[PDB]
Each structure stands twice: as structure tokens, then as C-alpha cells.
Amino acid sequence: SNCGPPPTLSFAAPMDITLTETRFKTGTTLKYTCLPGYVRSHSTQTLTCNSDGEWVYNTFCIYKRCRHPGELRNGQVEIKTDLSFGSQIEFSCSEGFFLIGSTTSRCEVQDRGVGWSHPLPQCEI
């Protein structure tokens, strides 16, 4: 009847109670917080220990979404996946227009939020 350390998470870290003992009461809960790139998903950002030595939670943090970076005059901003954290958008020009600058951008953590890694390109000539 005993669960060890919490599993560490990709999406959230614990709210600092670092003065922690080797295992945790078979009914204890754990207040968490979203990591950079993620926003709070459910009412409950928490882990919990059940009667039989396991850790259990619902994923309470989801990829934050970027702004759409606006029109690309004479080009095409193409969303591969989506516009949320970790996802790439591609730039490409039309007709005779060549593209100058980055051909990709990725929702990266920026400030306390989430922006595009590379600036928009110019679609010119």
C-alpha cells in the first residue's frame, strides 16, 4: 500500500513542495503547474495517490496556440499540423515569386507565451 516519487511529466511540473519525504500517503494529492508551451486544461492541475501505490491524474495541460502570423503577401502560409506549440507552418510563394527568408516557423515558447520561431518571409521578385 505505497507509491514512490511522482512520475515526472512532459507538460507540467510540481508546485514546489520540495521538502518531500521518500514516498507519499496512500491518499495524498499533488498541486501542479503548466510548463512553458502549455496552458491549463482542466479545473484540476493535480496528481493523486490511490489506495494501491500508483500515481493518477488527467492531463491538465495542453499545447498553447500561436497567433496566425497573418497574410503573406504573394505567398501561402501552410499549416502542416495546427498552430499550437511545437507545430510547424511552412511558407511558399506562388507563380514567379521567389521566397526570401525562412521557409518554416514553429510554435516555440516565447516570453510567458508562445510565438513563431522564424519571422515571416517576404514573397517577392
Partner: peptide
């Protein structure tokens, strides 16, 4: 995706504004 971009971004800004406005509340009991 010229005006749909504008629509999305706006929605986002609201949703973002809603997101934590809601949460800052449920946090604040």
C-alpha cells in the same frame, strides 16, 4: 485565411482572456 486568420487570432485573444480569467477565479476559490 486572410480574414479567417483575423477571426482565429481574435477568438484566440478572447479564449486566452477567458482561459485564465476563468482559472484565476476557480483558483481564487
Amino acid at each position: 485565411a486572410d480574414k479567417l486568420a483575423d477571426a482565429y487570432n481574435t477568438l484566440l485573444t478572447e479564449h486566452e482572456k477567458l482561459r485564465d480569467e476563468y482559472y484565476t477565479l476557480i483558483d481564487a476559490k
